[PDB]
Design a protein around this ligand. Structure first.
Ligand SMILES: *[C@@H]1O[C@H](CO)[C@@H](O[C@@H]2O[C@H](CO)[C@@H](O[C@@H]3O[C@H](CO[C@H]4O[C@H](CO)[C@@H](O)[C@H](O[C@H]5O[C@H](CO)[C@@H](O)[C@H](O)[C@@H]5O[C@H]5O[C@H](CO)[C@@H](O)[C@H](O)[C@@H]5O)[C@@H]4O)[C@@H](O)[C@H](O)[C@@H]3O)[C@H](O)[C@H]2NC(C)=O)[C@H](O)[C@H]1NC(C)=O
Ligand SMILES: *[C@@H]1O[C@H](CO[C@@H]2O[C@@H](C)[C@@H](O)[C@@H](O)[C@@H]2O)[C@@H](O[C@@H]2O[C@H](CO)[C@@H](O[C@@H]3O[C@H](CO)[C@@H](O)[C@H](O[C@H]4O[C@H](CO)[C@@H](O)[C@H](O)[C@@H]4O)[C@@H]3O)[C@H](O)[C@H]2NC(C)=O)[C@H](O[C@@H]2O[C@@H](C)[C@@H](O)[C@@H](O)[C@@H]2O)[C@H]1NC(C)=O
Ligand SMILES: O=C(CCN1CCN(C(=O)OCc2cc(Cl)cc(Cl)c2)CC1)c1ccc2[nH]c(=O)oc2c1
Ligand SMILES: *[C@@H]1O[C@H](CO)[C@@H](O[C@@H]2O[C@H](CO)[C@@H](O)[C@H](O)[C@H]2NC(C)=O)[C@H](O)[C@H]1NC(C)=O
Ligand SMILES: [Ca+2]
Ligand SMILES: [Ca+2]
Ligand SMILES: [Cl-]
Ligand SMILES: [K+]
Ligand code: NA
Ligand code: NA
Ligand SMILES: [Zn+2]
Ligand SMILES: [Zn+2]
Length: 785
């Protein structure tokens, strides 16, 4: 119980959090039904509106007014934002020329620039194309400050997962807010957009920016605004807090707008009804900038104008129904819409057959507008699996479409979001303006998981452990850049020489018949191994590898293919050639007998014999130390990549450096598995089966320079292919590989950083580039939009 008969007099929007039985006056009181009886009348004043008029200039202060035009209002920090414009002949901030901020220009008592996070819900990246005619304030921030053409949100491209990702620097699978709605099987409770369940602390993991701030003695403003508090009041409150004494004043502030998301759902992103809501948000930005200018803070504060996700054209008519694919939809619960998550209606039903359900949802209609996946098979770039709240069965929905259980479940909407985070329509905005951000600078697109580290740096805070790559966004900043340190190598390699004779081996294999290796094939230095293990560096004419004695295969295989390289076929008599490696013991080698016995498992090679520099060098590609276990269905993908696509990339990019290898992620946590976690081996052997195969393809950004003679920045594209026993994911896989393999690889595009987490390897340790630039390169994701 709370005594609401108390009063908010002189307590409106107080920073001290009050709890029952005392009545609250803070912004959050509304969502706990604990505001004092007079909160609306004292704290949500609307009298005379939000703008000063000429007749109000120099007025005697009236406490009933929403905002003031009295001579004392600047010293009290509660002027209407246009006070100096109307009463003192000042210009609106938007009308001022763009002037470089070389150092913060703050009033006395400020020791560092405050940070204001201006969050806009559903602000699609392409809305910026409307320019100054629609949004002059936002356009000025964008062109005068630092901006990206777009920022990549996290999957699902929904509000609660993305806002909490912005606050923590974590993937939803780690922070726990995996959707706008979610069922936790341990709690046996459901989190919803509406209701009280979401207010329970048990759902919210990690460490949000406001907690990081308070734990390190930095004061934070609210990061939650009640829908009943109008935007003009949110801006005035922030300005009032910025006017508090030095010992009370917060260092970080957040503003939130439900728009343009609200109108986006009603009218779609291309709707003519979108113009007025965008003009209204721009007016709010204008009030904040004018408000800051009159308080002499417009060249003091850092402003981050950021969105949570974009908006797509989605209609009721474009809905796929599970009732058209499955006999009994009454036995299942579906999280529907722009994504699908399926689980049995009865939480632990033994009759629930996910295998039969997936089979009925796989390639059943030619233009099917969704694809089913067991969560561990989802593209690794989504990082959407390691949480009990994520159902095993997932449906990736095609952009512009919805999925529903049955038809029973005019249309209420014309727009929606939630789709795959690489989708153009889901892309959102990023603008950084102020003394710490760069002046009139465009930066390449980046992921929202990276902002938490930057916000910590802008506030002098040590970030909590997160999924960002600290230093990868250093190019956005004038100052407060993070000096990163190269991770120390944990395991030094062995460099084995010849220690065995051909006669020492009995592997059941048959075969009919250092130097400059490092310089040519290892262009960016040796990858470092960041965990404790036993491995060997093996040199060859055409490739170099880091061979694991534990996993009996390379952790990585590195090779360079020039633009002029010749592709050759494997001679008929060498098709089944596998040769013992005299540098590696029989006890630390794979064997052909295991592969022959295993009627479901074949083998591939990491360095392809097809790309050998000579028939003599080709024999090295058939070494037992270059072989890896591969399902025949996967070999169709792998062989096409090696025989066709590597040469294609070398020819188009002027040579390529390729690093390929296995990945073991049986527990789908996005991290390298330890031995005990491996759940599949080649029949009757200790040869582990990878869950995935990666490749990192590097070349010169300036393609007029060959990959092996690049003087400047690099260009990279990578992938993490699922090692599957079938090609059920690719509906057109019965056709030639030229019709589907590339499409599959593009879907499984990845960052070098994703591969580093999955392998415990550290790449690009020896380049002529700055470490900050290399960190940006590692976070790059090649999208095929
Ligand atoms: C993205 O970045 C994060 C953060 O660095 C990485 O996640 C971390 O991984 C390490 C190594 O696996 C984990 O440490 C292990 O776990 C415990 C400590 O765990 C407890 O204490 C920490 C710190 O106080 C706390 O954050 C943990 O919170 C988990 O559990 C809460 C209660 O259930 C929950 O609310 C919260 O969301 C979080 O759940 C998530 O993590 C667990 C695993 O911990 C996972 O099962 C679950 O599905 C969620 O994803 C927890 O109380 C140590 O004793 C061990 O020795 C070991 O060191 C960290 O706990 C974990 N941190 C977080 C915040 O998840 C990701 O790996 C990285 N991803 C990639 C791909 O790089
Ligand atoms: C819920 O709150 C009501 C409103 O009170 C205000 O808000 C609360 C949260 C708190 O901040 C209060 O201080 C605010 O007044 C409560 O009603 C009030 O109850 C108090 C008594 O508990 C009343 O007081 C007296 O007011 C007189 C003036 O009108 C004073 O002269 C008097 O002072 C004498 O007594 C004190 C205490 O011994 C001495 O120290 C002094 O020297 C002096 O001799 C008191 O201060 C107040 O007037 C009430 N306000 C109103 C508007 O009625 C409410 O309390 C309940 O209801 C009231 C009507 C009484 O029956 C209470 O006994 C009863 O608890 C709160 N509800 C609950 C359940 O606690
Ligand atoms: O329910 C909501 C919004 C509810 N709140 C979001 C959080 N919020 C707030 O002020 O967040 C501010 C904030 C918090 C954090 Cl963690 C981080 C930052 Cl950078 C900023 C209050 C309003 C919603 C929004 C869009 C939707 N689209 C849709 O289909 O359903 C929707 C529901
Ligand atoms: C998968 O789809 C098939 C239809 O293609 C379902 O099988 C049919 O079920 C009905 C009963 O509703 C029978 O009358 C038909 O004879 C069945 N057809 C065939 C070809 O067997 C099947 O039930 C679906 N499975 C699931 C799990 O939904
Ligand atoms: Ca319309
Ligand atoms: Ca793992
Ligand atoms: Cl959801
Ligand atoms: K076999
Ligand atoms: Na509230
Ligand atoms: Na197929
Ligand atoms: Zn949103
Ligand atoms: Zn929305």
């Amino acid at each position: 119980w709370t005594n609401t008969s108390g009063s908010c007099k002189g307590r409106c929007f107080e920073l001290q959090e009050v709890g029952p039985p005392d009545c609250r006056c803070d912004n959050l009181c509304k969502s706990y039904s604990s505001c004092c009886h007079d909160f609306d009348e004292l704290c949500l004043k609307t009298a005379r509106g939000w703008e000063c008029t000429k007749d109000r200039c120099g007025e005697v202060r009236n406490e009933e007014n929403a905002c003031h035009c009295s001579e004392d209002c600047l010293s009290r920090g509660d002027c209407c934002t246009n006070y100096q414009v109307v009463c003192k002949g000042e210009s609106h901030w938007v009308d001022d020329d763009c002037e470089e901020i070389r150092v913060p220009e703050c009033p006395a008592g400020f020791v560092r620039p405050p940070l204001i996070i201006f969050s806009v819900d559903g602000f699609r990246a392409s809305y910026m194309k409307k320019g100054s005619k629609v949004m002059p304030n936002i356009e000025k921030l964008r062109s005068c400050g630092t901006h990206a053409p777009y920022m990549r949100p996290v999957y699902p491209t929904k509000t609660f997962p993305n806002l909490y990702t912005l606050a923590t620097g974590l993937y939803p699978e780690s922070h726990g807010i995996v959707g706008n709605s979610m069922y936790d099987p341990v709690f046996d409770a459901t989190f919803h957009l509406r209701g009280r369940e979401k207010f329970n602390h048990r759902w919210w993991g990690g460490q949000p920016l406001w907690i990081t701030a308070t734990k390190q003695g930095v004061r934070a403003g609210t990061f939650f605004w009640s829908v009943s508090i109008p935007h003009e009041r949110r801006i005035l409150t922030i300005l009032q807090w910025l006017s508090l004494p030095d010992n009370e004043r917060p260092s970080v502030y957040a503003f939130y707008s439900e728009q343009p998301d609200f109108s986006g759902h009603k009218y779609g992103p291309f709707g003519p009804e979108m113009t007025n809501p965008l003009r209204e948000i721009d007016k709010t930005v204008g009030q904040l900038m004018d408000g800051l200018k009159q308080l002499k803070l417009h060249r003091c504060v850092n402003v981050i104008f950021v969105g949570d996700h974009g908006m797509e054209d989605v209609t009721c008519d474009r809905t796929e129904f599970l009732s058209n694919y499955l006999t009994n939809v009454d036995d299942i619960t579906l999280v529907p819409g722009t994504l699908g998550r399926i689980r049995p209606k009865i939480p632990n039903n033994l009759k629930y057959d996910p295998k039969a359900i997936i089979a009925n949802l796989t390639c059943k209609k030619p233009d099917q507008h969704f694809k089913p996946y067991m969560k561990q098979h989802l593209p690794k770039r989504l990082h959407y699996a390691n949480n009990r709240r994520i159902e095993d069965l997932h449906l990736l929905v095609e952009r512009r479409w919805h999925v529903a259980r049955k038809p029973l479940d005019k249309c209420f909407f014309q727009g929606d979001h939630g789709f795959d985070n690489k989708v153009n329509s889901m892309q959102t905005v990023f603008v950084g303006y102020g003394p710490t951000f760069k002046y009139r600078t465009k930066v390449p697109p980046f992921e929202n998981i990276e902002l938490y580290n930057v916000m910590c740096d802008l506030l002098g805070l040590k970030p909590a452990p997160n999924n960002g790559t600290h230093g990868s966004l250093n190019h956005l900043l004038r100052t407060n850049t993070f000096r990163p340190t190269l991770p120390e190598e944990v395991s030094r390699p062995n460099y084995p020489g010849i220690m065995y004779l051909q006669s020492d081996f009995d592997l059941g294999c048959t075969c009919d018949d250092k130097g400059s290796t490092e310089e040519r094939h290892l262009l960016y230095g040796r990858p470092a191994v960041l965990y404790r293990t036993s491995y060997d560096i093996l040199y060859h004419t055409d490739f170099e590898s880091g061979y694991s004695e534990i996993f009996l295969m390379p952790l990585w295989t590195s090779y360079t293919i020039s633009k002029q390289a010749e592709v050759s076929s494997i001679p008929e008599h060498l098709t089944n050639c596998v040769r013992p490696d005299v540098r590696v013991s029989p006890g630390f080698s794979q064997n052909c007998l295991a592969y022959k016995n295993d009627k479901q498992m074949s083998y591939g090679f990491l360095f392809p014999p097809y790309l050998s520099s000579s028939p003599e060098a080709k024999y090295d590609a058939f070494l037992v130390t270059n072989m890896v276990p591969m399902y025949p269905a996967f070999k169709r993908v792998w062989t096409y990549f090696q025989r066709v696509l590597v040469k294609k990339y070398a020819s188009e990019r002027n040579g390529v450096n390729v690093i390929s290898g296995p990945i073991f992620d049986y527990n789908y946590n996005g991290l390298r598995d330890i031995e005990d976690e491996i759940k599949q081996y080649v029949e009757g052997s200790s040869i582990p089966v990878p869950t995935h195969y990666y490749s990192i393809i590097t070349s010169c950004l300036d393609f007029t320079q060959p990959a092996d003679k690049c003087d400047g920045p690099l260009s990279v594209s990578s992938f993490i292919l699922p090692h599957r026993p079938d090609n059920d994911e690719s509906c057109n896989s019965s056709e030639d590989e030229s019709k589907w393999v590339e499409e599959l690889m593009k879907m499984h595009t990845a960052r070098v950083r994703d591969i580093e987490h999955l392998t415990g390897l550290d790449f690009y340790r020896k380049t002529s580039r700055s470490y900050s630039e290399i960190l940006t390169l590692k976070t790059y994701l090649h999208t095929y939009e």
